[PDB]
Amino acid sequence: AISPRTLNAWVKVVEEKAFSPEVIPMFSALSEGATPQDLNTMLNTVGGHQAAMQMLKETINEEAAEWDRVHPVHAGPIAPGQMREPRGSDIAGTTSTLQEQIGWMTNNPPIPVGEIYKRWIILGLNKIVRMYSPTSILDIRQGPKEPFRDYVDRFYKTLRAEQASQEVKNWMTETLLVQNANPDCKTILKALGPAATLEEMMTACQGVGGPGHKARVLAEAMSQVINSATIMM
Amino acid sequence: AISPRTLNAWVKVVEEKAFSPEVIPMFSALSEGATPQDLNTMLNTVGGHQAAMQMLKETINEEAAEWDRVHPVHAGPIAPGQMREPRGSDIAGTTSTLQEQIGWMTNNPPIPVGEIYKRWIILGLNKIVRMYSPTSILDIRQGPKEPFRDYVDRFYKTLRAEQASQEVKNWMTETLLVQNANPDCKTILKALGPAATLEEMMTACQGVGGPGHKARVLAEAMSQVINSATIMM
Amino acid sequence: AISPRTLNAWVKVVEEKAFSPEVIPMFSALSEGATPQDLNTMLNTVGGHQAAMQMLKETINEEAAEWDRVHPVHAGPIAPGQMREPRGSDIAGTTSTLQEQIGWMTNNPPIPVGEIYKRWIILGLNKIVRMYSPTSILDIRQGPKEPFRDYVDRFYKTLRAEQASQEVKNWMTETLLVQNANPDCKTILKALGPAATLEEMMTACQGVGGPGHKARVLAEAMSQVINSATIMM
Amino acid sequence: AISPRTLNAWVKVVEEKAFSPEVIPMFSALSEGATPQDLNTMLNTVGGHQAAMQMLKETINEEAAEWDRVHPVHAGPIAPGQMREPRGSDIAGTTSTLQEQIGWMTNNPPIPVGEIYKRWIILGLNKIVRMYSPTSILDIRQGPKEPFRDYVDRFYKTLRAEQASQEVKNWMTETLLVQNANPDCKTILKALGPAATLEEMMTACQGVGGPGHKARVLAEAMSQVINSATIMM
Amino acid sequence: AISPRTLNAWVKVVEEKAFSPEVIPMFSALSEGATPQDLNTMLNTVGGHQAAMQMLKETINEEAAEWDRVHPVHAGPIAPGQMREPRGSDIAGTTSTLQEQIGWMTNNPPIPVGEIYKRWIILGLNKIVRMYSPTSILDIRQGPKEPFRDYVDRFYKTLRAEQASQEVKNWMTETLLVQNANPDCKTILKALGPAATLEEMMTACQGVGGPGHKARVLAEAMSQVINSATIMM
């Protein structure tokens, strides 16, 4: 088996870092000579980022289907002993036991089912590294035509998944949320001093995008125009 | 035994949160009916914060000494079977095996050594909650008379332990480090636009605190005084 | 065993590069299927950087303690043959021989003690990669209030460990040492032309920081002030 | 054996990326426990970049020679069975069969010839990573004194090896080729609007470097001089 | 045999220092009483500087030929025992084994083949010390009529072999490359501030040496002449 601190360190590295091309080294290093059951154990222990786990699990099942497609199940009628060759269904450890897993790995010849599963998972992780883009708290920005309340609601929504301590989150919430708004709601949210709370702020920019507010802004632009349309009249 | 995802979730909660008075509930909940060996396993799996682990381990050994002090070791000469009562040395699982641990917990009467160890660890964690103060990246501030280079060196030194992703750290390094300096080095670091790197910044404030710089500042103050010492002359 | 050129190439890569997250790949690649004794051999062959070797050796001994804590030593009374299971003390190859090491690795089942030691060392190297910061000759800068002689003494002190050829070191000594001084000693060291030696330079800035020199500088600042304090009188 | 999709993914990574220090991880990961024949198979499947393949093949043969130099061929007269030890000639799989390869890898003790070949290939790939410099389409620039026609001929010559789709290549051919010419031919190629084809362009700059053209340019420079040599006369 | 740290220290001294007349002492000291096979082992472990290794290997083979020329191979028909005298072919350890090497060195009289090989290698190293000139990064200078791009290409080409750490190389690349150019390209590369990258620099001096640029420079010289050719007209 594998020691719990190894699994914790590996998962620490997976949370701690964004998708990057160097995950495979650390994975192959820590997951050394393990058994397939333990590898799937190591797989489902990842927390969050289930989006990519979708594609990963999919490339696994696809390789499983292809190994099935290459290998025939013809066997018998030998009396039960070393009962079949492995199957793309069980190489991933879905329908087989640790006992059966050992009876594969210590028997001669040692068919390295674990190694094959490792190879597949590496292929998958590579494809993932190519097909992902890490999301942060830093990128979340207000759309140009977007109700401010929904903006804050998405802000907190993704913020709750951010991996940091408490006080970081507080100061984060204080600096970026206001800083990253559109110019339209910023030029009103920032006139009101940075002492009010999210409630007063919400009630402040609640008018943006509406007809009364668009009127106001258009009138201010037109008045600034005509002020000099008439300096010379 | 305990399932690996339980240990990962508990440790996730311990890293993710600062010392707070509510850790004990979650700990007692997850660490339910476990065996002492597993509890110590759950203990040493914590990563970082070894400072408090010092005091924790100490309160454990102190309770162990006191349980020793209360319980006598007189026993025998019964032939080997259920060989002794437990000991403050082994209740913490230092000199006993999982086998011996079971031979304690399933035998009648079930002396709940695990429960006692749980009680001690709870006492300890409580004392820790009282005697700690969480450190952040947010608190690190420049001393009033402090070489700026050492300031940045401590900044990064504690920054490397911060528990967050990559791009957070980058923007962190860009905003707080400059913002949190003393007024003396700030009024020179901030005159130079926020486009230069840490090297140019370092070479800029390298003069602060020195005699040539103290001269400069004193002369500017005195000149501003005398400018009006003489407006009226 | 391992061939000497492999060890030389690996150590070449370790000296040649600063701490970086990609050391583990090359290490696991070169240190392939080796025996634990050879791995420790590969460990102590590193030259310099003993600071991190402290922490590395420590994480090894800690994993060793934990493997001890998990595995019981109960065994016997079988007559001597395959005499015990390995121990966290000897898995690192402290109290065991190459003979005993082989008698572990070629026997059935092959308990891959070497692989386990590899796993531990990888864990350690990773933790090192996180907890280090490479020092260079390039960073060494004069403190703001620092006797120039001690500055040069530290310069050479760390310079002697720099990994380069002779003439590089010479030109290094000529350009950075003077360039990286504080403005106070620079404005005197650089008035004296770049033809004098370290001795004349030392005798030149020997006055900085002292009361006579602070007087001089303060008087020059005050005189420049009063020159225009009186242009208008 | 190895599955074809693994080989395709590995070769995809090798084409897709320039020489970089992280190829070894992915290589060792995918090429796991394989047989030497398969490793050489994986070697010659690389497409293009044969230049470095020269040096790679050379470091392999050199290690082979050295292993020969260390290991004696004395053996016999045992009747044929496990017939010799391997040889630096056949460890690389030149003069041995897959059958003989298996008769090495499954026999006791399993002499890991494949692992040794892996070690050599890793050494080689590392040396390659050090001794290469990736060429692009982006670097190709006109020499200062260079017939424009040869410039375009080299442009296309290396362009045909670029690894991209069709329309990319078209727009590439339209923007960089003209942009990257020398000022001399650019100041004539760019006066003619960007609507003419490569033929008209070729006929345009065909005069550069020649005596008639050098005359023209020298006369224009001299005339611009004398225009003000005489403003004041 | 020889201990690996001895070989590493010797090779450290060989890389670390340029060709100098004092290598022989350290070599003879470390390579003490060794066996010829180990000496050749110590020879091919040198990394880089293969140029001189050519001449070295050549003087070895020449001494080997001469020892052949002096010593006759007549021997026999004694039954196999201490089978021949050594040969200039095998004294260098090309066609002999460590076993045969021992059967030479421990037999009476001990023909010190290793000592003779040592003598030859010393002769060779001496001749090398005379016939070499160390190349540095420091000497690389731009030819007077040389396309700047090729200049940078050679700069990096030899730079990649320099034996130093990362940040040294960076600052090296920043200071010497620009400093060491010809006056012609320097007076344009240095007018553009030291903030642009190698790409902008390349595009800047791409015009040098060409007819348009030679025109420009000649016109500026002639105009400066005529400015005073006419002050007095």
Numbering used by the authors:
A (entry chain I), B (entry chain D), C (entry chain E), D (entry chain O), E (entry chain J): 146 to 378
Question: What is written in the article reporting this PDB entry?
Answer:
It is a polyprotein synthesized from the unspliced viral mRNA, and is cleaved by the viral protease (PR) during the maturation stage of the replicative cycle into 6 proteins and peptides: matrix (MA), capsid (CA), spacer peptide 1 (SP1), nucleocapsid (NC), spacer peptide 2 (SP2) and p61. The CA and SP1 region multimerizes forming the immature viral lattice, comprised of interconnected hexamers. SP1, together with the last eight residues of CA, have been hypothesized to form a six-helix bundle responsible for the higher-order multimerization of Gag necessary for HIV particle assembly.
The GagΔMAT8I construct lacks most of the globular domain of MA (residues 15 to 100) and p6. The GagΔMAT8I protein, however, was not soluble when released from bacteria owing to its self-assembly into spherical particles inside the bacterial cells. Upon iterative refinement, the final density maps of the Gag hexamer from GagΔMAT8I assemblies in the absence and presence of IP6 and GagT8I VLPs were obtained at 4.2 Å, 4.2 Å and 4.5 Å resolution, respectively. The SP1 helix in the GagΔMAT8I map is complete and extends to the SP1 and NC interface, therefore allowing model building of the C-terminal portion of SP1, from T8I to M14. This density is coordinated by two lysine rings formed by residues K158 and K227 (K290 and K359 in Gag amino acid numbering) near the bottom of the CACTD and above the bundle. Considering that GagΔMAT8I assemblies were produced in E. coli cells, it seems unlikely that the density in GagΔMAT8I map is IP6 (left). It is plausible that a small anionic molecule other than IP6 assists in the charge neutralization of the lysine rings and promoted assembly in E. coli-expressed GagΔMAT8I. While CANTD, CACTD and SP1 are rigidly connected as seen in the GagΔMAT8I map, NC-RNA is flexibly linked to SP1, resulting in a smeared density in GagΔMAT8I subtomogram averages.
